[PDB]
């Protein structure tokens, strides 16, 4: 048999089989409930929609995300997502196939305990494991050594890995994330007199962010130039055919990653946490962490974020040491691809937490065995 590999971002479920080249299922990890009065007796009725159903019907629905900042915030929604994943989308009985599950590096242990319990009690998967995403991105990118910046829908985190040793004091976590770029994006789009005030409408904002955002290679220049005269300004079609037109502003959201002062976050931007992460590392390794920067996760996908990073961290590093940035075009998937590799390694077969060993040990075992 072949393990299942299932990855929960905040923003998508990515699922498929171990040793497959790319995930068999992707859908937004979103649960919708009908809010309005059902008129038509004898039309279909459902207590909930999941994924591409809630996409297809969003206007009628309150859409809510079960995961906020890599924390599963209520469990019946999550259970319903996993159910939809194994039975409806992948058509696999979980009892037959072991499963591999994915998490952000610092979130509460209760997350792992509940995520275990639901897997053994509800689905009776033969065996389970949990892996820190930044570990997986190195498997995906063919490296043993690097610092991974990984940024999802709900969390951004740094984990430096030198030659197969993760380095836990090194590790840093920010909650600047795609969702909280979007929640800013609405508020500044209000400056142009558009307003997007419901979750179904908010997803339209996210489609704007995905299509038209980009990162300023340097920010004050374009903030002066586009305000002076705008060639750059570009315009988008809402679902009803209204055309709406966005100028300087489309860069101003990606810049929040580099200046959380806009949102009022305490922290420094991702570049300064990346530098402070390598500065936490031992001087012996730092030469190779500077070279192997790996970008990971969809929030990195904004055009120019690579070169803005390569430029801005170079200013902080000493000139003699040199900076290289790696952002393969598939990087959004890479956290899944690394799980596809890891789950298929023959050595891994010892790694897994097994129905017998859980049944003896209690769900606390995941802290002890898994890391």
């Amino acid at each position: 048999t072949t393990a299942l590999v299932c990855d929960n971002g905040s923003g998508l479920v990515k699922a498929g089989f171990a040793g497959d080249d790319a995930p068999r299922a992707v859908f937004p990890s979103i649960v919708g409930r009908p809010r309005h009065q059902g008129v038509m007796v004898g039309m279909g009725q459902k207590d909930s929609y999941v994924g591409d159903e809630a996409q297809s019907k969003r206007g009628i629905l309150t859409l809510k995300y079960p995961i906020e900042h890599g924390i599963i915030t209520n469990w019946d929604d999550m259970e319903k997502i996993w159910h939809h994943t194994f039975y409806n989308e992948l058509r696999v009985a979980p009892e037959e196939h072991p499963t591999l599950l994915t998490e952000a590096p610092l979130n509460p242990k209760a997350n792992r305990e509940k995520m275990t319990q639901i897997m053994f009690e509800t689905f009776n998967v033969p065996a389970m494991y949990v892996a820190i995403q930044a570990v997986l991105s190195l498997y995906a990118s063919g490296r043993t050594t690097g610092i991974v910046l990984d940024s999802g829908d709900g969390v951004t985190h740094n984990v430096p890995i030198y030659e197969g040793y993760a380095l836990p004091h090194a590790i840093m976590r920010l909650d600047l994330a795609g969702r909280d770029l979007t929640d800013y994006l609405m508020k500044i789009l209000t400056e142009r007199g558009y307003s997007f005030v419901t979750t179904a409408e908010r997803e339209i904002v996210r489609d704007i962010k995905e299509k038209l955002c980009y990162v300023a290679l340097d920010f004050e220049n374009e903030m002066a130039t586009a305000a002076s005269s705008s060639s750059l300004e570009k315009s988008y079609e809402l679902p009803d055919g209204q055309v709406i037109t966005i100028g300087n502003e489309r860069f101003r959201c990606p810049e929040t990653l580099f200046q959380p002062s806009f949102i009022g976050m305490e922290s420094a931007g991702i570049h300064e946490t990346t530098y402070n992460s390598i500065m936490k590392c031992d001087i012996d390794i730092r030469k190779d962490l500077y070279a192997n920067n790996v970008m990971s996760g969809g929030t990195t996908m904004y055009p120019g974020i690579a070169d803005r990073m390569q430029k801005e961290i170079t200013a902080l590093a000493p000139s003699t040491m040199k900076i290289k940035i790696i952002a393969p075009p598939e990087r959004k998937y890479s956290v899944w691809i690394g799980g596809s590799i890891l789950a298929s390694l023959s050595t891994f077969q010892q790694m897994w937490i097994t129905k017998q060993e859980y049944d003896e040990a209690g769900p606390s075992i995941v802290h002890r065995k898994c890391f």
Binding site: I67, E68, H69, I71, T73, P108, D175
Partner: peptide, 7 residues
């Protein structure tokens, strides 16, 4: 979360 943040 349980403290410093809404989740």
């Amino acid at each position: 979360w349980x403290a410093x943040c809404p989740a």
